[PDB]
Structure formats: C-alpha cells, structure tokens
Amino acid sequence: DMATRFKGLSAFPITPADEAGRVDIEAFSALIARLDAAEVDSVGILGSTGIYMYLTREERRRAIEAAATILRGRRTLMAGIGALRTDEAVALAKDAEAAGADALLLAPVSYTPLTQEEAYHHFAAVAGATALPLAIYNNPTTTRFTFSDELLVRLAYIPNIRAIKMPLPADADYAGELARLRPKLSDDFAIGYSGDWGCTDATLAGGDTWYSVVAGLLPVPALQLMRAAQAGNAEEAKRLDATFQPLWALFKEFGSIRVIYAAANILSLTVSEPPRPILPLTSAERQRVEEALEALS
Amino acid sequence: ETDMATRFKGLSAFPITPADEAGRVDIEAFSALIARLDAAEVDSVGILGSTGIYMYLTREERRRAIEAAATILRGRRTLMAGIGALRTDEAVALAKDAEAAGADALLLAPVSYTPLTQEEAYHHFAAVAGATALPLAIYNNPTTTRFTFSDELLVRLAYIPNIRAIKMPLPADADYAGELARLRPKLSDDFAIGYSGDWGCTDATLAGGDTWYSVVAGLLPVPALQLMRAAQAGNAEEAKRLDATFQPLWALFKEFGSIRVIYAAANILSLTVSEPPRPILPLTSAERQRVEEALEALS
Numbered sequence: 001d002m003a004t005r006f007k008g009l010s011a012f013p014i015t016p017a018d019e020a021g022r023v024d025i026e027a028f029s030a031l032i033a034r035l036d037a038a039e040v041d042s043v044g045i046l047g048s049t050g051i052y053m054y055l056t057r058e059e060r061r062r063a064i065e066a067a068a069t070i071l072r073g074r075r076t077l078m079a080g081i082g083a084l085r086t087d088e089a090v091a092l093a094k095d096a097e098a099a100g101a102d103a104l105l106l107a108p109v110s111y112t113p114l115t116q117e118e119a120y121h122h123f124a125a126v127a128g129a130t131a132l133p134l135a136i137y138n139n140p141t142t143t144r145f146t147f148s149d150e151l152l153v154r155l156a157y158i159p160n161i162r163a164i165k166m167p168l169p170a171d172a173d174y175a176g177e178l179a180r181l182r183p184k185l186s187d188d189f190a191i192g193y194s195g196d197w198g199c200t201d202a203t204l205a206g207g208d209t210w211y212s213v214v215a216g217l218l219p220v221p222a223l224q225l226m227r228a229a230q231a232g233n234a235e236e237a238k239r240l241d242a243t244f245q246p247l248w249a250l251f252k253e254f255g256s257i258r259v260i261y262a263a264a265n266i267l268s269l270t271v272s273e274p275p276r277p278i279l280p281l282t283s284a285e286r287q288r289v290e291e292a293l294e295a296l297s
Numbered sequence: 298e299t300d301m302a303t304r305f306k307g308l309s310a311f312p313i314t315p316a317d318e319a320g321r322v323d324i325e326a327f328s329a330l331i332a333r334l335d336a337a338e339v340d341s342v343g344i345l346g347s348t349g350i351y352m353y354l355t356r357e358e359r360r361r362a363i364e365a366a367a368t369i370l371r372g373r374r375t376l377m378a379g380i381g382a383l384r385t386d387e388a389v390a391l392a393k394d395a396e397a398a399g400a401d402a403l404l405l406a407p408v409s410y411t412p413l414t415q416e417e418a419y420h421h422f423a424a425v426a427g428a429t430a431l432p433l434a435i436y437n438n439p440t441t442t443r444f445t446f447s448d449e450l451l452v453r454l455a456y457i458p459n460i461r462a463i464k465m466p467l468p469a470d471a472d473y474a475g476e477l478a479r480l481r482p483k484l485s486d487d488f489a490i491g492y493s494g495d496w497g498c499t500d501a502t503l504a505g506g507d508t509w510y511s512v513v514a515g516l517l518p519v520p521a522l523q524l525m526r527a528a529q530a531g532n533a534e535e536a537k538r539l540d541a542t543f544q545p546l547w548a549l550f551k552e553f554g555s556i557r558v559i560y561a562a563a564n565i566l567s568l569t570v571s572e573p574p575r576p577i578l579p580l581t582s583a584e585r586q587r588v589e590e591a592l593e594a595l596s
C-alpha cells in the first residue's frame with residue numbers, strides 16, 4: 001500500500017529563490033542534503049512552505065530535478081502540485097513524475113469558489129495523470145476550499161489517493177476527528193496533520209503523519225519529538241514539545257512561512273526573502289526568532 | 298478631465314472571455330461581445346474580471362484579449378482591464394502590459410495563497426499603482442480571495458493618487474446607505490464607490506452607489522443599461538420594475554454563481570461555444586433549461 005510512504009515525519013523545506021523567482025539551486029541543494037543527512041521520513045518540497053504557487057512551472061521542475069538527483073530514490077520525495085486550472089495541475093503532476101518525485105501533494109487552489117463535485121473531478125484528473133500516489137492537501141487557509149466529510153470519502157476511494165494532510169480541527173479534538181474519519185475513509189488511508197503547534201498532540205492521538213514546517217529547517221529536534229509522539233510516549237513527547245513553544249508562539253502570531261524564512265537567514269541556510277507580496281519580519285521580531293532557536297539548541 | 302474617478306461611474310459591463318479548453322482566447326467571439334457592448338453605449342467595458350476568467354488565462358492570452366478589445370473599441374468607450382497575480386512582480390508586468398495594449402483603467406484584486414497582512418496588501422497595491430499612469434479601481438471581491446479590506450486599509454489605498462474607485466461586495470445586511478455614509482467621509486474626496494453582485498445593485502445604486510460592476514451587462518447590455526439609467530435617475534419604481542424582469546436570472550446567479558449561469562446564457566444566445574475553465578464546470582441539463590426560461594422572462 002502506497003499509504004506507507006506518507007507516514008512519519010515529512011519535512012517541508014523552503015525553496016530559496018531570488019526576487020525574480022529564480023530558484024537558488026545551490027541553497028536549495030544544501031537544504032535537501034541537510035534533510036537527507038538527518039534521515040527524515042520524507043522530504044516535502046514545493047508545499048506552502050516551499051512557495052510552489054509563487055514559482056513558475058519551469059522553476060518548480062528545476063527544484064524537483066535537483067532534489068531527485070540528491071535523494072536518489074533513497075528517501076521519499078513528495079512534490080506540491082497545485083494550479084488554478086486542471087490542465088496545468090495535470091501538466092505539473094506529469095512534470096513531477098518525470099523529474100523524479102515519489103509522491104504528489106495536491107491542494108485545491110481556487111479563485112472562483114469550487115463546488116464539492118468540481119473538486120472531485122479535478123482530483124480524479126490529476127490522480128489519473130501519473131502512476132504516483134497522491135496526498136490530499138487539505139488547507140482551507142491557503143486554498144479557500146473546505147472538504148466535506150462526504151467529499152473526503154469520495155476522494156479516499158480514488159485508487160492512487162492514499163493520504164491526507166488535515167488542518168488542526170478548531171476543536172483540538174484529534175481523537176474525535178480520527179474516530180469519525182477512519183471508519184469512513186478507505187482502509188489504511190494515511191491521515192496526518194500540519195500546523196506544527198498541534199502535531200504532537202495529533203500524533204499522540206493516533207495521527208499517521210506530521211507534515212512539518214520546522215522539520216524542513218531543524219530536522220534533528222523535530223525527529224526526536226516525532227519519535228516520542230509515534231511511540232505514544234506522552235510524558236516525553238510533551239516535555240520535548242515544550243522546547244518548541246517559543247517557536248510555536250511565533251508561528252501562530254506571524255505565520256510559519258515568515259518565521260521560517262527569518263530562522264533560515266539566522267542559520268545561514270538562506271539569503272532569500274519571501275516572494276512579494278509576502279514581506280519579512282521586523283528586526284525585533286527576528287530577535288524573537290533567534291531567541292526561539294536558542295531555546296531549542 | 299480633472300479627476301480620473303469619473304470614468305469609473307455608471308454601468309461597467311463585464312463580458313466573458315471566450316477561450317478553448319487549452320485557454321486560447323477565441324478572439325472572433327470576444328470581438329463580437331466587445332462590439333455589442335460599444336453599440337449598447339455602456340459606460341465602461343470591464344474585461345478580464347472574474348467573469349472574464351483572468352486568473353485562468355496566461356499573461357500572453359490576457360494581453361491578446363486587451364489588444365483585441367482596444368482594436369474593436371478604438372477609444373470610443375472606457376476600457377478597464379483586470380490585472381491580478383499572486384506575485385507583485387507579475388501584477389506589475391500585467392499592469393504595464395494592459396497600459397501598452399490600450400486599457401484606460403485597471404482593476405486590481407488582492408489574489409492570495411498565503412494570507413497577506415494589511416500592510417503586505419498595501420505595498421502590493423502601491424507597487425502596481427506606481428507601475429503605470431492609468432487609474433485603478435480596488436477589486437474588493439472577498440469570495441475569490443478571503444481577503445478583508447479593513448476600513449483602515451481602504452483609507453490607505455484610497456489615498457494612493459491614481460487609485461480612484463472601488464468595487465465593493467454587497468453588505469451582508471444590505472445596508473448600502475449606512476455603508477456609503479461611513480465610507481465617503483473617510484476615503485479621499487470624490488472616490489467612486491460602486492458595487493457588484495447583480496441582484497443587489499439596483500438597491501445599491503438607488504442608495505447612492507456610483508457604479509454597477511455588472512455581470513449580466515457583459516452579455517445583455519441593452520436591458521441592463523435601461524435598468525442602470527432608471528436607478529441613476531432616481532426612478533425607483535421603474536428601476537424596481539425592470540429589476541424584477543431580471544429576478545429569474547438573479548435567483549440562478551445566487552444559487553449557482555453568476556459565472557456558471559452567464560456561460561450557460563452565452564451558449565444559449567449563440568454568442569460563445571466556450572465552457573468555463575476547468576475545474577469550473579457548466580450547469581446541469583435541467584439548470585441550463587432554467588437559464589433559457591430566465592432569458593425568455595427577461596426578453
């Protein structure tokens with residue numbers, strides 16, 4: 001079952017690029033090598049963290065090729081696919097497969113609000129485009145699309161769709177959400193989470209995957225936390241999670257993407273800034289990030 | 298001739314942009330739509346809005362569309378063009394393209410993936426506004442962005458010298474008069490405040506709205522203009538009478554989204570063979586039939 005490759009810690013690096021959107025493949029390569037060396041379960045490139053929607057088809061392809069040449073099929077490489085048009089999403093999926101991705105992550109990016117049925121047909125078309133397994137990128141924040149349970153059931157029954165990145169339920173009722181969904185979705189479907197500040201509780205509650213922003217930059221401490229959570233070691237996991245709380249606070253206040261760019265600059269892992277119109281943090285805010293990193297190290 | 302706000306007033310008609318499955322604009326069908334708008338004497342032609350699928354067309358096809366509209370109009374009617382992009386640099390380039398291709402005005406939406414701060418939206422608008430000599434309208438369409446302009450941000454933007462208008466969504470409580478009374482004193486003098494959401498725009502205009510950014514007018518400009526003129530003249534009962542002829546269409550817009558309905562209507566009227574850009578899908582068999590009935594009711 002291709003669901004297996006979606007499990008565990010999936011690390012989402014930034015995609016360093018200049019002001020014109022040209023990917024800095026040297027810096028990107030350094031980030032990938034760092035993740036391979038740390039032995040994350042998968043590398044999720046071109047997610048929201050990796051600014052896929054702010055890069056051209058060609059620059060996305062360049063990033064995937066570079067990551068594939070490094071990982072050499074020895075660590076799962078997942079690539080963000082999204083586009084406003086179905087035909088572009090299909091093309092991007094085919095590109096990712098040809099460039100060496102092992103898995104696809106599909107967000108229902110929208111302009112004109114889509115019906116549940118329209119989202120279904122879009123997913124089916126992209127799923128049919130390649131032999132790769134696909135995860136549903138369920139992120140109403142960025143996509144402005146909300147999956148009904150009914151739609152999730154339909155999608156979980158498309159042959160190569162084997163996983164979902166869920167948002168944190170407003171509830172923090174991860175156990176309740178998993179108890180509701182698992183019986184409804186296809187057997188062994190991988191149900192995971194993003195929103196780093198809730199992911200240890202989500203994993204302790206039974207979540208299959210942490211789609212992790214912090215891991216894309218600091219894979220080592222993120223791995224230690226994830227392993228404790230996966231083992232159901234709640235005492236240890238909660239202690240380790242507390243070390244990240246200063247970083248979590250910053251994620252919640254400012255959005256993880258702005259914080260992670262600031263952190264990457266502090267660690268000399270990038271000189272890039274977010275793609276405009278996204279703007280970086282203030283000097284005082286960057287200082288808070290520096291202090292948050294100190295708490296971890 | 299003093300204030301560029303004046304070109305944004307009245308009926309701004311938003312045609313579809315006919316295009317094949319690959320996103321190649323059908324310039325022949327588009328040309329006829331533009332010509333029909335000019336013949337009906339609409340106040341402005343608003344191409345490449347959400348109705349005109351601007352976000353589903355390439356920079357090159359968008360330019361082709363603007364060039365064609367300018368070619369047909371030859372400066373006889375104000376041409377406004379939608380110019381949004383996720384990236385500031387692409388939005389800037391689209392604006393420059395539009396000016397070079399013969400647009401008279403620009404319409405700018407805060408297209409988002411990663412949610413933007415109020416300040417981030419400000420700098421994006423300022424960069425685009427600074428990129429050309431054209432006036433710009435703020436495209437306040439939160440259903441396509443989930444970006445809420447705070448009143449503070451509207452004040453900031455309305456002070457950008459060449460931003461002279463805004464397309465507001467319908468207020469949730471339908472208090473047009475209250476909204477206008479709050480905004481007019483805070484925004485720059487003579488700022489043109491208009492509305493979209495066709496089923497609410499007769500009321501909005503009667504309450505004092507400056508512009509109807511109109512979906513139905515892009516296809517059926519003659520009855521839409523009759524309606525707008527009655528509302529503008531303060532002929533409230535005539536306006537309401539005319540508004541009621543559109544009510545079958547209004548109900549379909551509200552249920553299914555105006556874009557899907559207007560594509561159905563354009564096909565029914567033999568003005569396009571195009572379908573919405575996938576993943577947007579057309580209406581059902583029975584639903585198209587309701588559109589046909591709505592058009593008969595109108596005609």
Ligand SMILES: [Cl-]
Pocket residue numbers: 232233234235236
């Ligand atoms: Cl325990």
